[PDB]
């Protein structure tokens, strides 16, 4: 039965010391939560398979297990390792010892050596005959069942026993709960602690959550949805089909021919319509050499050909080297030339006994032309001549063009299975796919079809002349929806772009969703899934899925004579955070690519300016970052300072001005923001030109200038102005009469101070507020870490270590390995620099936007809607931040409203009166005029409206009276 | 061949509902839902204020209301006829769709190139050559195909940056033209902007 | 005023007999404002100034012949190049 | 900047990229096709 075995069965995959690192390796490991056989040693000692290596663990109290035996038959017929542990002297022998019928313990050797509370775990594996021993000693206190915990096994001993181990056996003492696990080629992430001991591991194939952890290379997974793998169905059986032809190829008439033709008049025989069994030719020992240029020597048993030609002639031994593309001589150029793209192989052997008896019958003189003082010359072959002997050479020309085959090997066919994923082999063409019937009317002469990508589309079965389409076996993406591991270990799996067929089931348009309960009640969606569906973790707890809400429904009570005008207001402050600059990196081409290697540098010199042009690009980036900072901050010609007495009309700014008591005159808010944001390969970091103190001085000057002079320092010279009138004019600029400011000045000041306090609480409690800057810092650190890690890649060389390649190969091969490493590292540098250029362009655009907002928002007043936050803009205050700027936007937001009746015009004596500013309102009995953005009823008079035209044109005019202020002045 | 397309999060029905809500808000409340909450206002006074915003006295609107309404309706008929008769109107979107289709088709077509190998088909390479030569042919094909992917990705990043700039301009125009009234010359079309 | 920037607030220049000097860069003359709740500075006359703003508009319309560049007047090079497609 | 970019592109023809010679006519005049395809492929890759 399964138990919560967790992470048992992990051993050190190699002999490399590592610490404080997560290492991904592929080796033979124990599957997590797999079955391990539980054995007893009371009052169960079977022989188990070894496979490719076995993990061993045991718990003892009286040293029951004292020696392992490995072998195949255990019957004295082969060498068998015998280990005995008596006293404190380990003795190892591998002779053919005669064991008793039932081995037990009481309470031709090639390598001899002579010298529950505690579990001693071991790993014994045989690689190419080498017996490798790993072990670990640790105390535990558990007898009843499998121990819970993790323990890694170090290697100590390596015994060269040379036995291929496929089975093993234990020894029980009869008058010891031992454990056996099994290794599999799984990929594991091993975590090494500060002392270099692995304490945990993740099995990348245990389940989708383990797949997510393995993909993201961490033991913690953040909340969200990740795409981790792809589902693919496996084939079940192979199908081998060949034409059922039994004719044999007349190879005897070619290889055992009585006489070969002359090289000037060589024969060209066609072999076709037969089965070519190459096992006879392979088994013949008479051949001296077999060098093939066309096909690999091991593929001739499976592959078969459209045509074979046997070119038969005799050459001189020393000329055997001459039958090759690119070679020259009296043979290659004048009488027998081969194409340089020739496909096939030239096979030759001596024939001294019969071919030479002297033999003067062999005469010599574009590819394959037979051009039948003469140009004709001959050789004198004699039986007493190894090289000068007449070699018999046969050139087999193979046509590999995709066409009907007629000469295929002696392999029996199998039946064909339809509508199943199978591994097929048609005349040497292999692959996996589903073979189905088709309605494509191929012509009788057509054998292969092709797709746009040049892949095979259909084949004609060589036994039954039908056309079968090949459709790749079903596949698709798998997505994992998971909450963070600090909350729960429950996950949901989404099967992408498939229906719930081939795979608590909820059908969506994104795929097959398994594991989430469908809830009809809507809420705002948290973790989006797609196609309008989002998921969240809510309540006993489980994963739920629902259709996202777009907001509360609110119908409009529209009518032609009703207007709502705000009666009260609230002052709100928002925070806008923008990146301004990025780290000024610099890369040393020579030390990075060819670190302290003269030979590598000398080879690098052949590439000219390729890197230094990226060095130029990086210099340009470094300069433009300081240009951006300089342009963003240097908008004030002078450094202004506040008075010692902060008599600012009741507005408290002590929380935004520098604090003189600090070692650096920064404000408390700046301290809060600064308190929230937290090698030898040619990678360096340059300092900025403008220090933090200098930036703080610029921001202090800008703030003091703004408060003491309004917009005058921006427009021209800094002209001092009192803050209450500055505030009144900023209110006037948005269509709100200053008397509202004067009436509510104490409320506005208190609301501002309270909003700032709320900003302090928000910044002190919500870490995500500065994500826009944390993400850029993390991206740059990650890019540099990736560049450094990239040095570990091999790119095809025998070794990734430059000192080990230079220290291992002579120049003629070292230069090749070095050019390969240089090419790979140059591609890595080019990719890095290109990505940096694109990111720099994005940062530059952001900096230009920040400068525009700075200039058109702090120095003046913006009339652009939503340019400086939602609401009616008043002013902004800059604050510095690491690699960025934060704006505090003060906005006017209507708070309370009443439903009022309105009218387009008022008639007096038949004249139509229209408002200069504002709207007409009625409280139900009398008509009033008030400003659109603030309820402030005033009497409708002739000084608010003007006369144009008459009442008979305008639709919707209402009857009223218009007061003339002069009338009572002349009446009284 | 491993090339798939993901669905958008916001469906066409939801986008239509958002545009309907925005249009109903604009028509019933002018700029007030943009500044704060959606507060109802009659259309004739909204039009008078739109006239005041461009330096044209509202009395012209009120005196000429019947003709203005007839010209507005005739203009709307003109938009209907223009959209029903001018096919080139959607070229700006047709070219982007065509560019994405061309990029995907060229990426698929690239599989037919040899890059120096004896054959473009991997299964015939494996079925004909022993591993000691197969590693060379396969890494060469891998290098070529990886370079093709890298070129595709770079072009996609540059086009994405251009689309981002266009989207930012569209959002700025939406915010400063539909919810309010623009005094910026030729920012929201030629003439004195109303709505 | 900063002339040749060095870093970390330090700039260098060639000044006086002449020699290379290093100094802390100036941010401008210091000028405090005599701020009070009853003081305003108002300009009485003005000057009209003209400034020049220069912006790039276009760049050279280059065209590159890949075949002539890579395989100039070489039939064999052209035949090998033909295998790289688009 | 545009003049410098074009001058660098022209100068790039002088680089060898590992071949026995940077000059195409001496490559073609000295090597048989069976090695010429390799040398030409190397130059094509570098120039592309
Ligand atoms: C590994 O050891 C196994 C075990 O003896 C060897 O396999 C045996 O080979 C004989 C000879 O044909 C067969 O009759 C047996 O059936 C095989 N044993 C089993 C369990 O199947 C194998 O040859 C060895 N391999 C190497 C590489 O040493
Ligand atoms: C192969 O074809 C070539 C032409 O492609 C033939 O060349 C002729 O050779 C004879 C004698 O050398 C000349 O008199 C002719 O002028 C050549 N050209 C033509 C068109 O006849 C050559 O003879 C052919 N060889 C064989 C064996 O068929
Ligand atoms: C506008 O709303 C504000 C609150 O948002 C009101 O301020 C409160 O007014 C009540 C009424 O007397 C007092 O009890 C509170 O002391 C006020 N709060 C603060 C923080 O001052 C304000 O009165 C409203 N304006 C009008 C005209 O009613
Ligand atoms: C202006 O704001 C400051 C900062 O909140 C106020 O000083 C705080 O309150 C008392 C004053 O009685 C100080 O002793 C505290 O140390 C200050 N708090 C903190 C957290 O430092 C100051 O009173 C305010 N002044 C006016 C006129 O409103
Ligand atoms: C609507 O406003 C009008 C004018 O402010 C109110 O009419 C005045 O009511 C007061 C009652 O306190 C009287 O002293 C005045 O004589 C009225 N004005 C006139 C011109 O007669 C009216 O009461 C308000 N509507 C409601 C429902 O209260
Ligand atoms: C304002 O006053 C009168 C009735 O109180 C109306 O004005 C007249 O309306 C009749 C009916 O259409 C016309 O024949 C006259 O030409 C109008 N006279 C004037 C001087 O305009 C009018 O209907 C009233 N307004 C409302 C909204 O009821
Ligand atoms: C406005 O101030 C300017 C300051 O430049 C005055 O310019 C000069 O003023 C002096 C004073 O008499 C004259 O001698 C010059 O003729 C003026 N300059 C020029 C170019 O004419 C200017 O006079 C002042 N204007 C007034 C009306 O007082
Ligand atoms: C593991 O052992 C249990 C013992 O009851 C058995 O039921 C189960 O089938 C085994 N696992 C597998 C994969 O066979
Ligand atoms: C145990 O004692 C026997 C006694 O003869 C001895 O031969 C043997 O070597 C001892 N075991 C070991 C492992 O040395
Ligand atoms: C020991 O090995 C030899 C081979 O040198 C073999 O002839 C002999 O039979 C083997 N004897 C035993 C007991 O294994
Ligand atoms: C690592 O070794 C040091 C040596 O003193 C020890 O103090 C520390 O506890 C060890 N760490 C672990 C995780 O065992
Ligand atoms: C050639 O002759 C040998 C001698 O008996 C025979 O074994 C072999 O099968 C023959 N093969 C061919 C290809 O001629
Ligand atoms: C064997 O090949 C012949 C040749 O055409 C064909 O008629 C027949 O179908 C094949 N046999 C089978 C079992 O398909
Ligand atoms: C998750 O739990 C860890 C516990 O160390 C905590 O530090 C972290 O803030 C938590 N994250 C969330 C999103 O709750
Ligand atoms: C199942 O899903 C497929 C898409 O994968 C869809 O085409 C098909 O119509 C679905 N089946 C039913 C019965 O809706
Ligand atoms: C709507 O909610 C009810 C609640 O009982 C549920 O039974 C029903 O299946 C839901 N319908 C849909 C379409 O989700
Ligand atoms: C005013 O009308 C709105 C709808 O336009 C309605 O929601 C609200 O309740 C009304 N308020 C009063 C006081 O009648
Ligand atoms: C509002 O519409 C009603 C219904 O047609 C109409 O009777 C009334 O005169 C209109 N009032 C205004 C002010 O437009
Ligand atoms: C005028 O006021 C400014 C700033 O308030 C001050 O610097 C200057 O000295 C004052 N000049 C006179 C003449 O009062």
Query: Could you tell me the CATH number of the domain that includes residue A107?
Result: 2.60.120.960
CB contact under 8 A, A638 and C35: no
Instruction: Tell me which residue of A704, A693, A692, A697 sits closest to A884, measured CA to CA.
Output: A692
Pairing of strands A906-907, A958-959: parallel
Domain carrying residue A193: 21-232
Pairing of strands A872-881, A363-364: unpaired
Neighbours of A911 (CB within 10 A): 16
Residue pair C42/C58 in contact (Cβ under 8 Å)? The answer is no
Q: Is A108 in the pocket of ligand 10 (CB under 6 A)?
A: yes
Which residues on A lie below 8 Å from D32 (Cβ)?
A: 326, 340
Q: Is A463 in the pocket of ligand 13 (CB under 6 A)?
A: yes
Question: Rounded to an integer, what distance in angstroms lies between the CA atom of residue A572 and that of residue A754?
Answer: 10
Question: Rounded to an integer, what distance in angstroms lies between the CA atom of residue A628 and that of residue A852?
Answer: 12
Residue pair A350/A280 in contact (Cβ under 8 Å)? The answer is no
Q: Residue A268 forms beta bridges with which residues? A: A311
Dig out the tokens for A534 from the structure. Answer: 């989002």
The terminus-to-terminus CA distance of chain B in angstroms comes to 49
Residue pair A649/A721 in contact (Cβ under 8 Å)? The answer is no
Q: Is C33 in the pocket of ligand 19 (CB under 6 A)?
A: yes
- Between CA C30 and CA C40, with CA C36 as vertex, the angle to 5 degrees is 85
Order across the sheet with A69-71: list the strands: A48-49, A167-169, A69-71
What is the widest separation between alpha-carbon atoms in chain A? 157
Question: Rounded to an integer, what distance in angstroms lies between the CA atom of residue A797 and that of residue A819?
Answer: 10
Question: Rounded to an integer, what distance in angstroms lies between the CA atom of residue A669 and that of residue A758?
Answer: 12
Taking CA–CA distances from B48, the nearest residue in chain A reads: A904
Q: Is A166 in the pocket of ligand 1 (CB under 6 A)?
A: yes
Instruction: Tell me which residue of A937, A916, A934 sits closest to A926, measured CA to CA.
Output: A937
Question: Rounded to an integer, what distance in angstroms lies between the CA atom of residue A743 and that of residue A886?
Answer: 31
Instruction: Give the ligand with the smallest distance to the CA of A66.
Output: 9
Dig out the tokens for A697 from the structure. Answer: 């001085």
Among protein residues, the one whose CA lies closest to atom 4 of ligand 3: A570
Burial class (CB in 10 A: 0-12, 13-18, 19+), A628: buried
Question: Rounded to an integer, what distance in angstroms lies between the CA atom of residue B168 and that of residue B157?
Answer: 17
Residue pair A312/A258 in contact (Cβ under 8 Å)? The answer is no
Among protein residues, the one whose CA lies closest to atom 1 of ligand 12: A256
Report how far Cα A701 is from the mean position of its chain's Cα atoms: 47
What are the helix and strand counts (H, E) for chain A?
17, 50
CB contact under 8 A, A299 and B14: no
Angle, in degrees to the nearest 10, between helices B131-173 and A811-857 = 10
Question: Rounded to an integer, what distance in angstroms lies between the CA atom of residue A844 and that of residue A809?
Answer: 48
Task: Please give the number of the atom of ligand 5 that sits closest to the Cα of A937.
Answer: 5
Question: Rounded to an integer, what distance in angstroms lies between the CA atom of residue A569 and that of residue A563?
Answer: 18
Instruction: Give the ligand with the smallest distance to the CA of C47.
Output: 7
Which SS3 state, helix, strand or coil, does residue A688 take? coil
Interface of chain C toward chain B, CB-CB under 8 angstroms: 83-86
Which residues on A lie below 8 Å from B195 (Cβ)?
A: none
CA distance A795 to chain B (A): 9
Question: Rounded to an integer, what distance in angstroms lies between the CA atom of residue A709 and that of residue A968?
Answer: 44
Question: Rounded to an integer, what distance in angstroms lies between the CA atom of residue A638 and that of residue A629?
Answer: 18
Neighbours of A74 (CB within 10 A): 15
Dig out the tokens for A669 from the structure. Answer: 């808010």
Instruction: Give the ligand with the smallest distance to the CA of A368.
Output: 2
Q: Which residues does A443 contact at the CB level (< 8 Å), separation at least 6?
A: none
Among protein residues, the one whose CA lies closest to atom 1 of ligand 18: A560
Instruction: Tell me which residue of A815, A389, A773, A295 sits closest to A576, measured CA to CA.
Output: A773
Q: Which residues does A821 contact at the CB level (< 8 Å), separation at least 6?
A: A795, A797, A800, A802, A805
Instruction: Tell me which residue of A453, A463, A452 sits closest to A427, measured CA to CA.
Output: A463
Residue pair A896/A879 in contact (Cβ under 8 Å)? The answer is no
Residue the block writes with tokens 């319309």: C61
Q: Which residues does A913 contact at the CB level (< 8 Å), separation at least 6?
A: A905, A906, A907, A942, A945, A946, A947, A962
Instruction: Tell me which residue of A4, A59, A53, A5 sits closest to A29, measured CA to CA.
Output: A53
Instruction: Give the ligand with the smallest distance to the CA of A904.
Output: 18
Residue pair A477/A227 in contact (Cβ under 8 Å)? The answer is yes
Dig out the tokens for A537 from the structure. Answer: 């973790």
Dig out the tokens for A656 from the structure. Answer: 């935004």
Residue pair A211/A230 in contact (Cβ under 8 Å)? The answer is no
Residue pair A168/A70 in contact (Cβ under 8 Å)? The answer is yes
Instruction: Tell me which residue of A238, A243, A239, A312 sits closest to A271, measured CA to CA.
Output: A312
Choose among A647, A690, A709: nearest Cβ to C33: A709
Residue the block writes with tokens 């507020």: A769
Give the mutation candidate from C66, C74, C86 for the D interface (greatest D CB count, under 10 A).
C74
Question: Rounded to an integer, what distance in angstroms lies between the CA atom of residue A631 and that of residue A852?
Answer: 10
Question: Rounded to an integer, what distance in angstroms lies between the CA atom of residue B32 and that of residue A852?
Answer: 26
Dig out the tokens for C52 from the structure. Answer: 């020049």
Neighbours of A91 (CB within 10 A): 15
Q: Which residues does A544 contact at the CB level (< 8 Å), separation at least 6?
A: A516, A517, A518, A519, A535, A536, A537, A538
Interface of chain B toward chain C, CB-CB under 8 angstroms: 106, 109-110, 112-116
Half-sphere exposure of A824 (CA within 13 A, CB side): 17
Task: Please give the number of the atom of ligand 19 that sits closest to the Cα of C32.
Answer: 7
Task: Give the neighbours of chain C: at least 3 Cβ pairs within 8 Å.
Answer: A, B, D
Residue the block writes with tokens 């340089």: A340
Dig out the tokens for D35 from the structure. Answer: 């090695």
In chain D, breaks (C-N over 2.5 A) are found after: none
Distance from the alpha carbon of residue A76 to the mean position of ligand 10, in angstroms: 11
Which residues on D lie below 8 Å from C59 (Cβ)?
A: 2
Task: Please give the number of the atom of ligand 14 that sits closest to the Cα of A223.
Answer: 13
What phi, psi does A854 have (nearest 5°)?
-55, -50
- Between CA A432 and CA A440, with CA A436 as vertex, the angle to 5 degrees is 115
Q: Which residues does C29 contact at the CB level (< 8 Å), separation at least 6?
A: A638
In chain B, breaks (C-N over 2.5 A) are found after: none
Task: Give the neighbours of chain D: at least 3 Cβ pairs within 8 Å.
Answer: A, C
Taking CA–CA distances from B119, the nearest residue in chain C reads: C83
3-state secondary structure A110-176: CCCEECCCEEEEEEEEEECCEEEEEEEEEECCCCCCCCCCCCCEEEEEEECCCCCCCEEECCCCCCC
Distance from the alpha carbon of residue A242 to the mean position of ligand 13, in angstroms: 10
Which SS3 state, helix, strand or coil, does residue A449 take? strand
Order across the sheet with A511-514: list the strands: A224-232, A475-482, A492-496, A511-514, A505-508
Residue the block writes with tokens 């729960």: A488
Query: Among A80, A166, A168, which is best to mutate for testing ligand 1, by the most ligand atoms less than 8 A from CB?
Result: A166
Give the mutation candidate from A526, A827, A864, A918 for the B interface (greatest B CB count, under 10 A).
A864
Question: Rounded to an integer, what distance in angstroms lies between the CA atom of residue A422 and that of residue B126?
Answer: 18
What is the widest separation between alpha-carbon atoms in chain D? 42
DSSP for A259-320, please give it: -PBPSTT-EEEEE-SEE--THHHHH----S--EESSS-TTTTTT--BS-EEEEEEEEEGGGG
Give the dihedral of Cα atoms A828, A831, A834, A840; nearest 10 deg: -80
Cα separation values, A952 from A907, A909, D4, Å: 10, 12, 76
Dig out the tokens for A573 from the structure. Answer: 């402050």
Long-range contacts, A736-740 (Cβ 8 Å, 24+) = A736/A872, A736/A892, A736/A931, A736/A933, A736/A934, A737/A931, A737/A934, A737/A936, A740/A934, A740/A936
Q: Residue A901 forms beta bridges with which residues? A: A562, A922
């Amino acid at each position: 039965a399964y138990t919560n075995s967790f992470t048992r069965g992990v051993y050190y995959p190699d002999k490399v010391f590592r610490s404080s690192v997560l290492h991904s390796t592929q080796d033979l490991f124990l599957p997590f939560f797999s079955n391990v056989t539980w054995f007893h040693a009371i009052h169960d000692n079977p022989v188990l398979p070894f496979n490719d290596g076995v993990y061993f663990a045991s718990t003892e109290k009286s040293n029951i297990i004292r020696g392992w035996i490995f072998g195949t038959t255990l019957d004295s017929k082969t060498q068998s390792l015998l280990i005995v542990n008596n006293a404190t002297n380990v003795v190892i022998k591998v002779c053919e010892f005669q064991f008793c019928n039932d081995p037990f313990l009481g309470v031709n050797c090639t390598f001899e050596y002579v010298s529950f509370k505690n579990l001693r775990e071991f790993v014994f594996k045989n690689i190419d005959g080498y017996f490798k021993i790993y072990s670990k000693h640790t105390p535990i206190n558990l007898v009843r069942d499998l121990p819970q915990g993790f323990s890694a096994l170090e290697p100590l001993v390596d015994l060269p026993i040379g036995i291929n181990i496929t089975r093993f056996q234990t020894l029980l003492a009869l008058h010891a709960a031992y454990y056996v696990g099994y290794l599999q080629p799984r990929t594991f992430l091993l975590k090494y602690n500060e002392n270099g001991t692995i304490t945990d591991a993740v099995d990348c194939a245990l389940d989708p959550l383990s797949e997510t952890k393995c993909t993201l290379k961490s033991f913690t997974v953040e909340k969200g949805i990740y795409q981790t793998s792809n589902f693919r169905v496996q084939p079940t059986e192979s199908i081998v089909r060949f034409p059922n032809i039994t004719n044999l190829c007349p190879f005897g008439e070619v290889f055992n021919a009585t006489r070969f033709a002359s090289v000037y008049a060589w024969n060209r025989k066609r072999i076709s319509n037969c089965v070519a069994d190459y096992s006879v030719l392979y088994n013949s020992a008479s051949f001296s050499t077999f060098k093939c240029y066309g096909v690999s020597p091991t593929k001739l048993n499976d592959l078969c050909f459209t045509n074979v030609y046997a070119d038969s002639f005799v050459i001189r031994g020393d000329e055997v080297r001459q039958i090759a593309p690119g070679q020259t001589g009296k043979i290659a150029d004048y009488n027998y030339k081969l194409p340089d793209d020739f496909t096939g192989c030239v096979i030759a052997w001596n024939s001294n006994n019969l071919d030479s008896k002297g033999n003067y019958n062999y005469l010599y003189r574009k590819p394959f032309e037979r051009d039948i003082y003469f140009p004709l010359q001959s050789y004198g072959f004699q039986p007493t001549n190894v090289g000068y002997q007449p070699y018999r050479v046969v050139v087999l020309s193979f046509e590999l063009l995709h066409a009907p085959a007629t000469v295929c090997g002696p392999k029996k066919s199998t039946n064909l299975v339809k509508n199943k994923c199978v591994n097929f082999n048609f005349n040497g063409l292999t692959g996996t796919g589903v073979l189905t019937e088709s309605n494509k009317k191929f012509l009788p002469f057509q054998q292969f079809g092709r797709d746009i990508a040049d892949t095979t589309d259909a084949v004609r079965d060589p036994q039954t002349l039908e056309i079968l389409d090949i459709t790749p076996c079903s596949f698709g993406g798998v997505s994992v929806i998971t909450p963070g591991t600090n909350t729960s270990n429950q996950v949901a799996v989404l099967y992408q772009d498939v229906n719930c067929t081939e795979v608590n089931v909820f059908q969506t348009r994104a795929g097959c969703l398994i594991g989430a309960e469908h809830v009809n009640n809507s809420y705002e969606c948290d973790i989006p899934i797609g196609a309008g569906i989002c998921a969240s973790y809510q309540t006993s707890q489980s994963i739920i899925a629902y259709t996202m809400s777009l907001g509360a429904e609110n119908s409009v009570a529209y009518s032609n004579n009703s207007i709502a005008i705000p009666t009260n207001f609230t002052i709100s402050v928002t925070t806008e955070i923008l990146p301004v600059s990025m780290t000024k990196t610099s890369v040393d081409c020579t030390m990075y690519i060819c670190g302290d290697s003269t030979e590598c540098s000398n080879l690098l010199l052949q590439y000219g300016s390729f890197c230094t042009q990226l060095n130029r690009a990086l210099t340009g980036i470094a300069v433009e970052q300081d240009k951006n900072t300089q342009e963003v901050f240097a908008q004030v010609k002078q450094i202004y300072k506040t008075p010692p007495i902060k008599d600012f009309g009741g507005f408290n700014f002590s929380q935004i001005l520098p604090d003189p008591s600090k070692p650096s005159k920064r404000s408390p808010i700046e301290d809060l923001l600064f308190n929230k944001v937290t090698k030898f390969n040619g990678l360096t970091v340059l300092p900025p030109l403008l220090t933090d103190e200098m930036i703080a001085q610029y921001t202090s000057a800008l703030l003091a200038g703004t408060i003491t002079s309004g917009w005058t320092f921006g427009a021209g010279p800094a002209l001092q102005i009192p803050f209450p009138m500055q505030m009144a004019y900023r209110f006037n600029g948005i269509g709100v009469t200053q008397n509202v400011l004067y009436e509510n000045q104490k409320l506005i000041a208190n609301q501002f101070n309270s909003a700032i306090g709320k900003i302090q609480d928000s910044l002190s409690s919500t870490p995500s507020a500065l994500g826009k800057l944390q993400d850029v810092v993390n991206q740059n650190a990650q890019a540099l870490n990736t560049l450094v890690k990239q040095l570990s890649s091999n790119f095809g060389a025998i070794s990734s270590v430059l000192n080990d390649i230079l220290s291992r190969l002579d120049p003629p091969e070292a230069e090749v390995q070095i050019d390969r490493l240089i090419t790979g590292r140059l591609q890595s540098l080019q990719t890095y620099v290109t990505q940096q250029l694109i990111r720099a362009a994005e940062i530059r655009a952001s900096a230009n936007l920040a400068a525009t907002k700075m200039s058109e928002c702090v120095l003046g007043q913006s009339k652009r809607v939503d340019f400086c936050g939602k609401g009616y803009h008043l002013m902004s205050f800059p604050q510095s931040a690491p690699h960025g700027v934060v704006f505090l936007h003060v906005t006017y937001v209507p708070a309370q409203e009443k439903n009022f009746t309105t009218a387009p015009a008022i008639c007096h004596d038949g004249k139509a009166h229209f408002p200069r500013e504002g709207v007409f309102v009625s409280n139900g009995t009398h008509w009033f005029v008030t400003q659109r953005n603030f309820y402030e009823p005033q009497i409708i008079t002739t000084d608010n409206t003007f006369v144009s035209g008459n009442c008979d044109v305008v639709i919707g005019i209402v009857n009223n009276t218009v007061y003339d202020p002069l009338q009572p002045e002349l009446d009284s």
